[PDB]
Symmetry: none
């Protein structure tokens, strides 16, 4: 939610970090 999503997106970002890593 508006509060959890902030933190949740942080876990998603991890995946985003996992993505950049493809480069990396």
């Amino acid at each position: 939610n508006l509060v959890s999503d902030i933190i949740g997106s942080k876990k998603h970002m991890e995946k985003l970090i996992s993505i950049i890593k493809k480069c990396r």
Copy 2:
């Protein structure tokens, strides 16, 4: 405000997050 600051920074991240897709 962490709530607004993080969610806000995310907006800034979104853009960065967008670039990664175009890595590529």
